[PDB]
Amino acid sequence: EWGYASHNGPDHWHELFPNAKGENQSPIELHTKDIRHDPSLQPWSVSYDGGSAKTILNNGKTCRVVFDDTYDRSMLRGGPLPGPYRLRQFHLHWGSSDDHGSEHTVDGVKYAAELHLVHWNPKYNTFKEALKQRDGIAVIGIFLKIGHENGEFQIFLDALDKIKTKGKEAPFTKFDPSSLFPASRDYWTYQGSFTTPPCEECIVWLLLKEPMTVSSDQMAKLRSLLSSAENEPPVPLVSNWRPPQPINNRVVRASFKHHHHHH
Ligand SMILES: [Zn+2]
């Protein structure tokens, strides 16, 4: 229905999805000088079940891994969340070249890609109902910095062979996404929305400070996917990222103390 071309891109979504025009849209630019450290922000911790991974697919917008959220198996707790959230799926956004690709930016710096781990509050009984609440969904956002090749990320990349084209899907199991987390757990949080239509404003964002490193070759593997079906001309699935939206005056807090700015 929508896309990332010039006729159906972000600047054209609001015409079909009113929420695109909302006041709490994501992503946003992160300027450390305008972000306050909140000492009350507690740590977040996860308990994932690698056996919970179910499918990997290509919907022509990105590549997503779907997990079994029929019950509390892979949970996210702590941080600014009121209770535990179920892991439902993770997907990526990336650019055409290594110099850009992430949706959020930290002090002007863009990364090659951004990984979004999507969770939802069971208190709301159902993902659909949860989508209606401002804190219904929680998303762990991880940046991918080019550097050392990532071993665990390779497990995921290899599977891409099975879903080169749009509309494809295949089994994917025994993969624990926490294996991709950097050593640091410091994060930034604010309330926003899904970066793709309908752009619901039901997300509590947790962006980790330390990015995950991946090799240029590995990113190359990522860009090998196609945004078009099978009996169609090869169209590379690149640039599936949304530019920053207006921060307005939303509170953006940091769980860590940044020593460089004051005494
Ligand atoms: Zn996303």
Curated annotation (Swiss-Prot):
Entry GO CC: cytoplasm; cytosol
Chief site of localization: cytoplasm
Regulation: Activated by proton donors such as imidazole and the dipeptide histidylhistidine. Inhibited by coumarins and sulfonamide derivatives such as acetazolamide.
Entry comment on modification after translation: S-thiolated both by thiol-disulfide exchange with glutathione disulfide and by oxyradical-initiated S-thiolation with reduced glutathione.
Expression tissues: Muscle specific.
Catalytic reaction equation(s): hydrogencarbonate + H(+) = CO2 + H2O
Keyword Transcription regulation: no
Record region (Involved in proton transfer): 61-64
One example of a Gene Ontology biological process annotation: response to bacterium
MF terms (GO), sorted A to Z: carbonate dehydratase activity; nickel cation binding; phosphatase activity; zinc ion binding
Domain (Alpha-carbonic anhydrase) ranges: 1-256
Obligatory cofactor(s): Zn(2+)
Modified residues (Phosphoserine): S26, S40, S45, S47, S52, S216
Binding site for Zn(2+): H91, H93, H116
Modified sites of kind Phosphotyrosine: Y124
Cellular compartment(s): Cytoplasm
InterPro entries: CA_dom (IPR001148), CA_dom_sf (IPR036398), Carbonic_anhydrase_a-class (IPR023561), Carbonic_anhydrase_a-class_CS (IPR018338)
Highest taxon above the source species: Eukaryota
Enzyme Commission number, as recorded: 4.2.1.1
Protein residues bound to substrate: T195, T196
Keyword Phosphoprotein: yes
Record key words, sorted: Acetylation, Cytoplasm, Glutathionylation, Lyase, Metal-binding, Phosphoprotein, Zinc
Modified residue annotations for Phosphothreonine: T70, T126, T173, T213
Family: Belongs to the alpha-carbonic anhydrase family.
Protein name: Carbonic anhydrase 3
Annotated organism of origin: Homo sapiens
